[PDB]
Symmetry: D2
Subunit: 280 residues, 4 copies
Amino acid sequence: DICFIAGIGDTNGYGWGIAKELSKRNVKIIFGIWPPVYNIFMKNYKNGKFDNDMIKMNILDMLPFDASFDTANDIDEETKNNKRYNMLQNYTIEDVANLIHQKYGKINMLVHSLANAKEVQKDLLNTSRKGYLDALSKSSYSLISLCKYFVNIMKPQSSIISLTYHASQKVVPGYGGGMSSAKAALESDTRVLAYHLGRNYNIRINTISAGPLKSRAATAINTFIDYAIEYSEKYAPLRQKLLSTDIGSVASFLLSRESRAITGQTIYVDNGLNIMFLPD
Amino acid sequence: EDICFIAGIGDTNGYGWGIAKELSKRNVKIIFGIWPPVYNIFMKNYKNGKFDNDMIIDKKMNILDMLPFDASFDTANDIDEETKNNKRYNMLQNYTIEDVANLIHQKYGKINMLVHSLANAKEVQKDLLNTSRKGYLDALSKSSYSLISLCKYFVNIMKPQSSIISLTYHASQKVVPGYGGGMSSAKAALESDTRVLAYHLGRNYNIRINTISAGPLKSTFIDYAIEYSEKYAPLRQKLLSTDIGSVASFLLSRESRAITGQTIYVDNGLNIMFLPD
Amino acid sequence: EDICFIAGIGDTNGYGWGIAKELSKRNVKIIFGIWPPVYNIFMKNYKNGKFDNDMIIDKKMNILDMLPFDASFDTANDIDEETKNNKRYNMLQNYTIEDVANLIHQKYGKINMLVHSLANAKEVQKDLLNTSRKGYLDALSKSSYSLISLCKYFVNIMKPQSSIISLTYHASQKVVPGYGGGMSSAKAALESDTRVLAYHLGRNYNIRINTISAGPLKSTFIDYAIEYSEKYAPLRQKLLSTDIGSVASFLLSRESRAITGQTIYVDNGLNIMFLPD
Amino acid sequence: DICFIAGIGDTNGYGWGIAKELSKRNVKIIFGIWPPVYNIFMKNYKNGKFDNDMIKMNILDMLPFDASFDTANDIDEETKNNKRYNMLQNYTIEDVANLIHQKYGKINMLVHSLANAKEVQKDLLNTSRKGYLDALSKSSYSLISLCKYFVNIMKPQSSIISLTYHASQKVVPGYGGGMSSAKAALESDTRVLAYHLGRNYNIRINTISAGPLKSRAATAINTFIDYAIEYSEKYAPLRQKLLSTDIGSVASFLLSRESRAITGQTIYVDNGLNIMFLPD
Ligand SMILES: NC(=O)c1ccc[n+]([C@@H]2O[C@H](COP(=O)([O-])OP(=O)(O)OC[C@H]3O[C@@H](n4cnc5c(N)ncnc54)[C@H](O)[C@@H]3O)[C@@H](O)[C@H]2O)c1
Ligand SMILES: NC(=O)c1ccc[n+]([C@@H]2O[C@H](COP(=O)([O-])OP(=O)(O)OC[C@H]3O[C@@H](n4cnc5c(N)ncnc54)[C@H](O)[C@@H]3O)[C@@H](O)[C@H]2O)c1
Ligand SMILES: NC(=O)c1ccc[n+]([C@@H]2O[C@H](COP(=O)([O-])OP(=O)(O)OC[C@H]3O[C@@H](n4cnc5c(N)ncnc54)[C@H](O)[C@@H]3O)[C@@H](O)[C@H]2O)c1
Ligand SMILES: NC(=O)c1ccc[n+]([C@@H]2O[C@H](COP(=O)([O-])OP(=O)(O)OC[C@H]3O[C@@H](n4cnc5c(N)ncnc54)[C@H](O)[C@@H]3O)[C@@H](O)[C@H]2O)c1
Ligand SMILES: Oc1cc(CCCc2ccccc2)ccc1Oc1ccc(Cl)cc1Cl
Ligand SMILES: Oc1cc(CCCc2ccccc2)ccc1Oc1ccc(Cl)cc1Cl
Ligand SMILES: Oc1cc(CCCc2ccccc2)ccc1Oc1ccc(Cl)cc1Cl
Ligand SMILES: Oc1cc(CCCc2ccccc2)ccc1Oc1ccc(Cl)cc1Cl
């Protein structure tokens, strides 16, 4: 059992919570880390910062990974030469697939745990074409392409999950930049992918619609997350605090053979908030 | 020590059984609630060892008890004289929803898992337009309200962070000609009630409730459904009662503590398709 | 010459009226079906001119007839002796669903528009978990099965390409605490049945059926709903009974010939929101 | 009553059916026409080809329009110089808005009736990043931007509609190139837009999920439409043939004041096919 986790940058997000829970079932974890935060994440690892947070994880490997790039030929010269990518290799999608396959053979688990939008702070009406396409490229297409290259290094009857948010289905003002659009496309693509992957590969794919968690990404939005969290803890059917390991144990289930008959689905792990119409 | 009450088994050929089997792997103690008119037959078969092969898990299914259980009666007060006189029922007692909760609580204490696994529609063969008021309401009574009454009465005998599931079918959401008698209507109400119940039980007791929308299991038209499913579903493998079982087991465990009010599809992904390919 | 039967009016303060008004603009002849216990009061008020202002369209609403109509009885056969004896009912006749279809057909011939605009739940004040089996099934009987029985009996007296609508509410799909007694369950069943009925009626009679999910109209918690709606809905204007009326008119016309089996939201867009802003 | 129809190229699609139905209610129609097909469409108009099809429409104007371009500054040099754009002016989104406002003042109706995807023939898994982003840019973002520039030349209480397809919600193999993704994003964006447009502008926006129609675009897909049409006519609850004027009269209703309380909605005009699970 080996899982590649694409999109972890610290211990405060869903990626880490998923890693933690998979470790409990003795799953081998490989981190794919965005080069802008790659070095600091490494430094904190060896300097034992995450030691309190790993309570012990089985981290097979930690690789540079940028889901903007499908192959080495896609890397633009500027990025190629950038201070933070300098200096790094094999971080495209095709490249990490190959690298992982060489080091470890075929894997059976894949987690898409990333999203990005340059103009998330703008509302949809005010988002540029460029910002909107960026959101879809990094948050949605990246999943499709992740699948395309990893299906060849995955066995049957492997499993894939991604993370989404209810703003795709119902209006959440402030979730801007085309992020709502990107989540809607990703939830749709999850179905279409589940069809092709199931038929041709006997591989499963689902997505988890998570509730609010105060992560790096969540703060990128101009107190929105604080309100989100506070509103959820007040109005959700379940009033417990939502933890990243709550999503993690659900991710672990979806990735395991116990969920062998579930595919193409959007599964809500949000203390039930999604079921509410009117505040209390 | 976890205990699960499974309401609605009649043989080892349905979802209830598949759910019992998977739960047993987690060392969950099982209590069966069985429709009185087939209770004695079931006990006989069980005694005659007909289920021995079905019970093997190198682990035996630990069946704590098997009780007569009728989802159409809420309390002793609701038993009509015609069933009181009735052959089968005459030699059985304490089979109303409240009576069974009291029995279980008395004999074994509080439980923490509840499975609603039962449906009945006396006119399931007639299409909706030709279903009588009597047939429709019977369908709703047995298949939908029974869930609410189960929750009403079993919540008092459940631990906090307990979990509840029922079984539903996609005919509630999309048209399946042949799934008649108001069974579609009953499933739609059940999925809606699952949300409303999730709010109440969640806020007032910290108890979760979800429903599993299952693909076809041979437990006529069922042969069509199964064939069509196996031809057109994203996943080619045969859908097993234990495929639903392992999902049920997870929803009933604390691994799913943040999931409630949901309809979870366990159907090889058939629900996602629009047109045959 | 188009004729629409509107089942479920009691005053000029609800959706039924708003729908009658808008249809009148299209020169549709209106027949009202009125719950017997308020039939006489309604006739009196109508006679005493209490509705004259409400009827102005420089066009008068053309009310072809007003008949007693009870959605809980399918045929003369279903009338229980307690209602037979009953004060109000005693002096009225032919108010069962089949009886009214026969009357209308006899007096006026075939119609081509049908509106189901009625809901009743005797325990609407209790939350779902505390609703009795009796209260739940009453809700389903009056609010959901009544639609099926209406279609069953009125289809024989309708022209081809006729059209049918009912009224529903979003509590079926998302939790609205306070909308109790199984009204949420009833609405969920009604929206599902609308699809199943659309298939049967569409294939067998080329008749369409849809439902309108309406926002709140003051016709307690309703004051909350209306206030919340007017604060948080995408559209600020007040939701009028005639906002539902004009949508109903369109769904009942041939302009919507390719729309059937749908739940159409007329609620200022409130349904699309997740969190208050 | 003036309506701008963005995305008509002949009389065989939904745009024309919508034009026809709006004319019946005495609405003034302005066509926005993709420059690749602009000249031939004009030529056929004056050469009376469409005369049989206009049975008489009130065509206020016919303008070159390319929804790929938000402003003149967005036009790339090659396109600017292309044989078919040569030669044409004011065809960006900002430009047609301005032009229409100068000629006619403010309008009250807008129809987004276009879609495009370079790789529609490929299935999702095999779509490139570039193809996928093209689909979203032309089919989805174009609506957002159309709204952004037209809201200023529209009165309250104006109305906007677009066209979508059920492949966003359920799997339709063969609807490739990210078109499924684009429709899912567009249905989501319709909600988010309905919120901002309703609150700030008292303007409505909805989308029509249409059934199959043998149009130019529909044939671009590698007999798929023929099967679609044939399957729908066999299995839809309503077995009448679906006409472009069936959508048109629904479009007319949504655009009119009769639908003043409907917004953010996906309305199915498809003889009811969407409600079916199992074939007959
Ligand atoms: N936090 C929430 O409230 C919440 C709610 C619902 C869904 N989600 C989803 O969960 C997922 C994880 O987000 P999170 O909340 O854990 O924040 P996070 O910051 O912990 O995770 C996002 C990670 O993705 C990485 N990343 C961004 N762009 C990348 C690229 N081009 N290549 C590779 N890596 C890149 C970042 O380094 C970052 O660490 C996201 O898909 C998000 O949309 C989050
Ligand atoms: N089999 C399928 O293809 C399928 C698909 C979707 C959903 N389901 C659902 O799964 C659940 C279990 O059914 P199944 O398919 O396993 O068949 P099953 O026979 O195993 O389960 C139904 C059981 O309910 C019991 N029952 C009937 N009336 C009762 C009453 N008044 N009181 C108590 N119990 C009563 C019967 O004894 C029967 O054994 C049902 O709720 C059904 O709607 C089944
Ligand atoms: N008002 C709202 O906020 C709202 C919102 C969503 C849906 N609805 C729906 O609109 C429909 C009309 O209700 P309304 O809000 O206009 O109030 P209303 O009083 O105008 O309509 C309900 C009518 O149904 C009649 N009725 C009750 N029991 C009956 C029976 N057994 N037989 C025949 N008729 C009976 C009553 O006389 C009553 O006048 C209902 O179906 C309701 O569920 C209302
Ligand atoms: N035909 C169907 O079966 C069907 C079904 C559901 C939805 N739809 C939708 O209806 C809408 C109209 O499509 P149709 O089927 O009528 O085909 P169509 O070819 O008649 O309409 C598409 C038009 O959009 C124009 N267009 C394409 N790219 C453009 C750009 N960059 N700028 C401006 N114009 C551009 C084309 O010139 C073309 O005339 C589309 O959104 C389509 O997705 C069609
Ligand atoms: O996909 C999500 C969803 C949430 C929930 C936030 C809820 C909320 C409510 C109002 C305003 C903002 C956010 C938080 C973070 C998140 O991931 C995001 C969003 C945006 C970017 Cl650019 C990156 C990432 Cl990782
Ligand atoms: O809830 C379900 C769902 C299915 C799925 C297949 C049923 C089907 C499929 C196609 C056509 C007709 C019927 C099968 C059985 C089932 O349980 C049913 C249905 C009806 C009654 Cl009266 C009781 C039970 Cl336990
Ligand atoms: O079907 C509906 C829907 C609403 C919408 C508001 C109701 C509401 C909102 C918030 C809290 C509680 C109730 C109001 C009235 C209504 O009709 C009802 C409801 C209940 C019964 Cl017994 C009859 C009828 Cl005619
Ligand atoms: O949005 C749609 C939807 C349909 C319905 C086609 C149904 C179908 C089924 C199987 C395969 C292909 C198409 C047809 C055309 C259409 O518009 C499209 C689609 C793709 C492009 Cl590139 C352009 C346009 Cl205008």
